Design a protein around this ligand. Structure first.
Ligand SMILES: Cc1ncc(COP(=O)(O)O)c(/C=N\CC[C@H](N)C(=O)O)c1O
Ligand SMILES: C[C@H]1O[C@@H](n2cnc3c(N)ncnc32)[C@H](O)[C@@H]1O
Lengths: 109, 578
């Protein structure tokens, strides 16, 4: 079993065996990292909001609504940025607005 | 400001004005090496700077109460359900050498899909919120000036809202955290695609805060039948999270492996666990070694726990350990008591000091049976890695039950934990980033289209808003309480009474628990039941047995009992001379 398997490493040197262990470790995590670059999730979106000056309660409502209108792909902190500038209010006020159910027909463009 | 070594911590005062508290510093601190240090008549080779205020070892009386401190950062874990009582157990550990205070999340926090707020009571752990975290970190600021050496507050960044708590930890100067997206999948059955996409953010936020990161490969140590056979997979779980954390942006010097010697006597545990310890440290150079102690092969005996732990400290000394966490000797007897967190520190400090300079005098026989097994474990792990690629990536390997299988890999029993790619908690919560996706904040990982609004701001996204909370703390929404009857102010009010009577406690103020040890001249079962009676007559309540040991079948039985004293004493009616 293990002796059969270990065939091709047996004459690998410690430097080769180590560099090979990390070489493959790297190739295994890469697809994971890419998935991480091109995609988003609710907790991530909520966290962007928290940093943007929103409370956990307010953040939930925006992301809960963002998901309904199918807008995750654009970014929840982005929905709150474009609506802030468009209607000329503070990031905070336009984020409160949205949380409460407002400016959602508008955000869709 | 404030803090007299003879006055208790005013936990009533620490809880006030938490809306205006700010962490005093950020990130991890290590111990300052103190070269050829002279304490009393002795010279120490492997010591760190002395504490300004501390409780030295009982036997330090024969030597002028000297209190030598070793080089590794020393962890103790304290989380009872009531963060407010524990702030006192913290102060006792700090005095005993612990400079890494680690706090367990209330049962099920992994599944909280968002932060919680305020201070409800915990179950088998503290509920981690901002008030509570600001509280404990404010108390540690005091406690660390008292002792004269910084203390790393640590907690957990797991769950379906890891990224959430990463922020809050970043804001509130939590110094260290666990972060390993493999924990979510294997033990909490959170969905793997969302779990790993989340860890990218989680980890970035953590790297921004300069926090230290501990992984959870050691978890596979416990949930595992014959722990010595798990050694190829440990290397695999340590490697995945490390190369991952590394490529996210985290510094190699802030990435800690959580490495526990898998065995304990009567196994020849040194012989078994040492090649592994060496293999790991050779294969992971430049990464940190956070040694933990044995919990799986534990039982009701404190004595036994301690001896196995000293052997655990011995694995660390023979090799290397940047942090040396501890486990209470009573871990298998009950939920840790004040006196036993302190035993854990004392013992860790005592053993390390007694082995000062040991490696100037001893060494590893690096060729022999040792190097052979160091080589074999390495091969077995590389093999495991080869098969995870062949099967076409990490998700497929998980789904095929590659992990948590009780076989000494390449051996596979089929008893491993299989999660579905498309299933779990949080399935269907991944969303594709669109071309014009943006996020106006520091510490964001994935694709962030910033150019569109300003080509210049690409590397400072938060300047679209004149600072995210990481630059502008005053933008942090602070919640105080969200429950009127379940919070710290009710709990503290409940017992104003006590702050001029007194009673014994193990975890919570005046909980009335005590420990009784006795010997009975009869077999165990009977001995045990006869034992309850004696305790009852002694006026204790809620009596239960927590340890039986056979001295010899017929001759005798040692019994140990935890029980509640149903009354108080008065410090003012105690006749005390000089
Ligand atoms: C990597 C990781 N993330 C989260 C959690 C737990 O946190 P929640 O259950 O609330 O998600 C754990 C727990 N076991 C670790 C033991 C610890 N080192 C101790 O020394 O006992 C973990 O290993
Ligand atoms: C059961 C739990 O619900 C939370 N919670 C969130 N919002 C509220 C609210 N408006 N009133 C009471 N509890 C609330 C608490 O954090 C609490 O402890």
């Amino acid at each position: 079993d293990f002796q059969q398997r270990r065939a091709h490493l047996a004459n690998l040197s410690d430097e080769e065996l180590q560099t090979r262990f990390w070489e493959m470790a790297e190739k295994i995590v890469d697809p994971l990292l890419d998935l991480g670059k091109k995609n988003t999730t609710p907790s991530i979106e909520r966290s962007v909001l928290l940093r943007m000056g929103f409370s956990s309660l307010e953040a939930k409502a925006i992301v809960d609504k963002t998901m309904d209108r199918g807008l995750m792909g654009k970014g929840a902190g982005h929905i709150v940025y474009k609506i802030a500038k468009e209607k000329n209010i503070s990031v905070r006020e336009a984020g409160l607005a949205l949380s409460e159910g407002k400016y959602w027909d508008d955000a869709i463009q | 400001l404030q803090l007299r070594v003879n006055e208790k911590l005013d936990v009533e005062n620490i809880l006030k004005d938490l809306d205006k508290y700010t962490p005093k510093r950020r990130g991890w601190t290590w111990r300052q090496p103190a070269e050829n240090l002279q304490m009393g008549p002795f010279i120490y080779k492997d010591a760190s700077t002395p504490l300004e205020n501390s409780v030295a070892l009982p036997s330090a009386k024969y030597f002028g109460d000297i209190d030598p401190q070793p080089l590794p950062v020393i962890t103790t874990e304290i989380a009872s359900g009531r963060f407010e009582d524990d702030i006192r157990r913290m102060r006792m550990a700090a005095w005993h050498g612990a400079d890494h205070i680690m706090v367990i999340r209330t049962a099920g926090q992994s599944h909280y899909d968002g932060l919680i707020e305020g201070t409800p009571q915990g179950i088998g752990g503290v509920p981690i919120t901002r008030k509570q975290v600001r509280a404990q970190r404010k108390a540690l600021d005091l406690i660390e000036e008292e002792v004269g050496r910084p203390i790393n507050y640590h907690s957990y960044v797991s769950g379906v809202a890891g990224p959430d708590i990463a922020v809050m930890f970043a804001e509130e100067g939590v110094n260290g955290a666990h972060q390993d997206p493999q924990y979510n999948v294997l033990y909490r059955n959170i969905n793997m695609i969302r779990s790993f996409i989340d860890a990218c953010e989680s980890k970035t936020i953590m790297a921004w805060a300069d926090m230290a990161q501990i992984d959870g490969a050691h978890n596979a140590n416990a949930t595992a039948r014959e722990a010595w056979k798990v050694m190829p997979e440990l290397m695999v779980q340590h490697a995945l999270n490390s190369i991952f954390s590394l490529k996210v942006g985290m510094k190699k010097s802030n990435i800690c492996l959580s490495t526990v010697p898998p065995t304990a006597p009567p196994a020849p545990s040194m012989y078994l666990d040492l090649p592994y310890a060496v293999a790991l440290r050779e294969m992971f150079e430049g990464y940190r070694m956070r040694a933990q102690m044995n919990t799986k092969y534990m039982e009701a005996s404190t004595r036994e726990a301690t001896v196995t732990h000293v052997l655990n400290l011995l694995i660390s000394k023979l090799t290397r350990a940047d942090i040396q966490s501890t486990i209470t000797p009573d871990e298998g007897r009950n939920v840790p008591w004040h006196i036993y967190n302190i035993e854990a520190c004392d013992t860790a400090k005592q053993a390390l000091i007694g082995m000062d300079g040991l490696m100037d005098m001893v060494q590893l026989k690096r060729e022999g049976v040792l190097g052979d097994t160091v080589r074999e474990l390495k091969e077995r792990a590389v093999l495991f890695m080869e098969e995870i690629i062949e099967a076409g990536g990490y998700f497929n390997a998980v789904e095929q039950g590659f992990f948590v299988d009780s076989g000494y890999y390449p051996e596979r029993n089929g008893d491993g934990i299989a999660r579905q790619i498309n299933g779990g908690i949080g399935a269907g919560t991944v969303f594709e980033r669109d071309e014009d996706y943006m996020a106006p904040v520091t510490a964001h990982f994935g694709y962030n289209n910033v150019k569109q609004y300003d080509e210049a701001l690409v590397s400072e996204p938060s300047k679209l808003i004149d600072g995210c909370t990481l630059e502008v703390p005053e933008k942090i929404v602070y919640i105080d309480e969200l429950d009127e009857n379940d919070n710290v102010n009710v709990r503290m009010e409940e017992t104003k009474e006590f702050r001029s009577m007194i009673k014994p406690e193990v975890e919570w103020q005046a909980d009335g628990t005590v420990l009784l040890t006795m010997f009975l001249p009869t077999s165990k079962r009977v001995a045990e039941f006869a034992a309850i009676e004696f305790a009852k007559k002694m006026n204790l309540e809620e009596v239960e047995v927590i340890n039986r040991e056979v001295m010899q079948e017929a001759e005798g039985t040692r019994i140990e009992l935890k029980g509640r004293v149903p009354f108080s004493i008065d410090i003012n009616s105690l006749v005390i001379p000089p």
